[PDB]
Design an enzyme around this catalytic site. Sequence first.
Site, PDB file in Angstrom:
ATOM      1  N   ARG A 381       0.824  -1.213   0.000  1.00 19.53           N
ATOM      2  CA  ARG A 381       0.000   0.000   0.000  1.00 19.53           C
ATOM      3  C   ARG A 381       0.853   1.255   0.000  1.00 19.53           C
ATOM      4  NH1 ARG A 381      -2.666  -0.624   5.090  1.00 19.53           N
ATOM      5  NH2 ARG A 381      -1.572  -2.591   5.417  1.00 19.53           N
ATOM      6  N   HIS A 505       0.575  -8.039  16.698  1.00 16.48           N
ATOM      7  CA  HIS A 505       1.519  -7.406  17.631  1.00 16.48           C
ATOM      8  C   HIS A 505       0.806  -7.059  18.930  1.00 16.48           C
ATOM      9  CE1 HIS A 505       5.235  -4.984  18.376  1.00 16.48           C
ATOM     10  NE2 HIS A 505       4.425  -4.292  19.156  1.00 16.48           N
TER      11      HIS A 505
END
EC number: 1.3.2.4
Length: 568
Positions: A381, A505
Amino acid sequence: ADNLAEFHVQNQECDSCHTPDGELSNDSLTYENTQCVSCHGTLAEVAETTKHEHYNAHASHFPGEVACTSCHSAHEKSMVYCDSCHSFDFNMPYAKKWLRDEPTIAELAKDKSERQAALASAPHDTVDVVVVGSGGAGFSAAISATDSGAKVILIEKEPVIGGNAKLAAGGMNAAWTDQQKAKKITDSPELMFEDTMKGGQNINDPALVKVLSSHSKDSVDWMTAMGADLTDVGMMGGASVNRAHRPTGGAGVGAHVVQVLYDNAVKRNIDLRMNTRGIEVLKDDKGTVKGILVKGMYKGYYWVKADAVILATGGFAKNNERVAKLDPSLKGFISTNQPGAVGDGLDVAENAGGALKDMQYIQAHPTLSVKGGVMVTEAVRGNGAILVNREGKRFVNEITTRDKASAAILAQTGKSAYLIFDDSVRKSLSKIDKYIGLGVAPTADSLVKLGKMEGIDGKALTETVARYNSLVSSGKDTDFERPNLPRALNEGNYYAIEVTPGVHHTMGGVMIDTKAEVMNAKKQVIPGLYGAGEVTGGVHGANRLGGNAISDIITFGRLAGEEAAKYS
Ligand SMILES: Cc1cc2nc3c(=O)[nH]c(=O)nc-3n(C[C@H](O)[C@H](O)[C@H](O)COP(=O)(O)OP(=O)(O)OC[C@H]3O[C@@H](n4cnc5c(N)ncnc54)[C@H](O)[C@@H]3O)c2cc1C
Ligand code: HEM
Ligand code: HEM
Ligand code: HEM
Ligand code: HEM
Ligand SMILES: C/C(=C\C(=O)O)C(=O)O
Ligand code: NA
């Protein structure tokens, strides 16, 4: 034969693999693996005999020197490590299905007998610092402590080095680097700090973010001095300017950084022990660290006497049971993580008196490949790809923060979306060739054809890319306010990657101060105990920025090693 040793002993003696007395050399099986190589050749030499067009068990992206016994056990059937993330068509002799079922630190309380005998024995080693975990933080700490005059032992519970750090793709954030200046980028530590705080919903500990931003250039310089290539600087979500550093051409940052750190540790003769799990931090009668009890897979329990222990054990994002108790919205999601990333290091930290913070803040990466399971880098992206839904339309600013991007994708039809890009984007980021090789980036010479292939409305898709390209040319995304429009999607063929969010995460963890010292719930330092990397809390707040974890682990790992050496 029912196992590999049985096979071999048909024509070989025990001492073909074993030492003279029969004793296993160490928990890394150094001697034994040397014997496999003596006959079969190195991993690279073996790899020449096991090539498939798009994969090879013996030639992977893993950095370091991957031991044969990581996958081939001798006296029992064994598991292919790659099966923890992929399902390649393999035929390993004496294989069994991949299954990870590692006892928790709590369950290992049942080894009361065994642990007491170990603690009643002499320490197997007496050193200055033990570092637990061979990811970026742990290697950085081991190197920096060694350069500061300390004798270190570095342990890793897995059979292979590198944790999740070796998987990092999109880059390492820093400002204002020589590398940025060479690419005509203007940035500052202050702007990195501001982006980071805003990105974290101002939950971040500002003293920790100041270390992150202010040390970032030095950490890039430190890695570069050790031989890393951090010269390509890309854009990530939630950043004001390009600051994600990675190797030339847009290769993966992680495997590279970990290889550099490994090579540097080997150069310094750092004592690295695989299949060696840190179990219990030992404290003296005044509550300062005196060492650590470890469990060697092959050699059993023993302890190391040391002034300092640095916990560099990473996050818990693989452990969906623990994740779901903290954030039920992530229950049942797939993970991007290595199979060991289950939070046992936090358990060790809490048992030693360390407090946790920010545990409820868990990041889903917005773009895992539906087909392959694996993370698809945000750099796709950042370098220009768009996202479309099944209706063939854009629906989100593709470089917003991950919280918002994940929500947007989950709101679309089928709870997934497609990255769409062309050959200009592909050529800009060599990591993309890895997805094509994995078979997750179907391609066609028109968007109508690509749409038909993937179940995206082909007319709408064609018009969407035309519209988007017009916004790129005019300099402003009036549809979704994407602030950076680097490339038109108009060169060569088109590609689609089906993507959906996955657990990635854990922003929370052990409470540290700005010297990486672990604190208890009263905010009192535990003398001799340090934490660095994803195992810590307070650096990233409610949402980590892409690129900020690799920055974190090098900065805080290096700081922890220096502080621990000084303390010792
Ligand atoms: C696929 C993927 C891509 C990513 N890409 C990026 C990126 O481009 N940029 C970015 O900024 N972040 C990225 N991240 C995040 C980042 O790589 C992780 O946050 C980073 O790996 C944290 O490093 P660490 O050193 O703290 O832990 P890790 O690298 O996870 O290493 C910790 C190690 O300690 C071990 N260990 C755990 N407990 C014990 C114990 N009790 N005893 C002994 N060893 C133990 C492990 O098994 C593991 O090997 C990515 C993560 C993934 C999963
Ligand atoms: C030959 C007949 C032979 C004997 C005898 C033998 C013994 C043995 C023991 C007792 C262990 C466990 C030791 C411990 O402390 O737990 C063990 C483990 C391993 N061995 Fe072995 N072994 C014999 C043969 C061979 C051969 C031919 C090989 C190599 C092909 C081999 C290698 C290994 C390895 C590796 C281990 C670690 C555990 C495992 O992978 O199964 N042995 N061996
Ligand atoms: C060390 C632990 C070691 C490993 C690992 C290993 C692997 C291995 C495999 C997977 C096979 C194929 C078995 C099968 O077909 O069912 C295989 C076969 C052979 N090996 Fe081996 N091997 C290890 C150790 C050793 C050592 C120390 C020797 C030489 C003394 C050795 C040799 C051989 C030979 C010969 C074969 C048969 C096939 C061939 O290459 O000729 N191995 N091994
Ligand atoms: C370490 C250097 C190592 C050796 C030695 C080794 C040996 C070995 C042999 C001999 C075979 C059979 C090859 C043949 O058919 O001629 C074999 C096959 C596989 N192995 Fe292996 N292997 C070593 C290392 C490792 C490691 C670290 C892993 C797991 C990451 C692994 C796994 C595999 C797999 C899978 C196969 C089957 C390959 C296929 O394409 O089906 N090996 N290995
Ligand atoms: C085990 C040693 C192993 C192998 C072999 C392997 C292969 C492999 C291939 C062939 C690809 C496609 C790109 C390439 O040719 O390098 C690929 C891509 C990714 N992998 Fe992998 N992989 C092995 C192990 C693992 C494990 C255990 C994980 C998950 C923790 C994992 C993850 C990924 C990811 C992510 C990718 C995407 C491309 C990239 O990031 O480079 N791999 N792997
Ligand atoms: C940049 C990151 C991942 C990726 O490459 O998308 C990360 O920081 O987690
Ligand atoms: Na954390």
